[PDB]
């Protein structure tokens, strides 16, 4: 049981997407990226995803609105929000009310993404495979 797992990255800033994807690929999992949370929500109806990292501030909707929609339809996905010092307030609220599994402070160190992703992917496994006959 290794990386037949999928990570989704959602961020309107395209250089965040590649800089996260480069780090995360070393882990060997499938990575799908979207600059639009609408497109990301659509893709989730057809594509198995174990972990999503969204940005906090995005045109169509905040990452906390996007991640709450994820929470409600795909309860087993690990939900991670990227947060600046600028987004302190919104991150705390998003936490207080269950919208995100974790947050990733930006600027991060490579070590930080690897950490959030490996741990998160392990917890998505637990939730998915819970109570089900393993073989």
CATH number assigned to the domain comprising residue 108: 3.40.50.2300
The range of the structural domain enclosing residue 38 comes to 1-135
CB 53, CB 116: distance < 8 Å: yes
Residue 112, both tokens:
């930080």
CB 70, CB 46: distance < 8 Å: no
Instruction: For residue 84, give the DSSP letter.
Output: -
CB 68, CB 56: distance < 8 Å: no
Instruction: For residue 87, give the DSSP letter.
Output: G
CB atoms within 10 A of CB 14: 10
> Total domain count for the chain?
1
Residues 79, 94: Cα–Cα separation, whole Å = 11
Nearest Cα neighbor of 48 from 30, 69, 71 is 30
Residues 49, 135: Cα–Cα separation, whole Å = 22
With residue 52 as reference, give the H or E element that holds it: strand 51-55
């Amino acid at each position: 049981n290794y990386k037949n797992y999928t990570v989704m990255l959602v961020d309107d800033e395209q250089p965040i997407l590649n800089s996260l994807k480069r780090l995360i690929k070393r882990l060997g999992c499938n990575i799908i990226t979207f600059t639009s949370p609408l497109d990301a929500l659509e893709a989730l109806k057809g594509t198995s995803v174990q972990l999503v990292i969204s940005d906090m501030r995005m045109p169509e909707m905040g990452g906390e609105v996007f991640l709450e929609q994820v929470a409600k339809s795909y309860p087993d996905i690990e939900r991670v929000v990227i947060s600046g010092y600028a987004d302190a307030q919104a991150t705390i609220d998003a936490v207080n009310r269950g919208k995100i599994s974790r947050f990733l402070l930006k600027p991060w160190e490579d070590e930080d993404v690897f950490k959030v992703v490996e741990k998160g992917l392990q917890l998505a496994f637990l939730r998915e495979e819970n109570l089900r006959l393993q073989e």
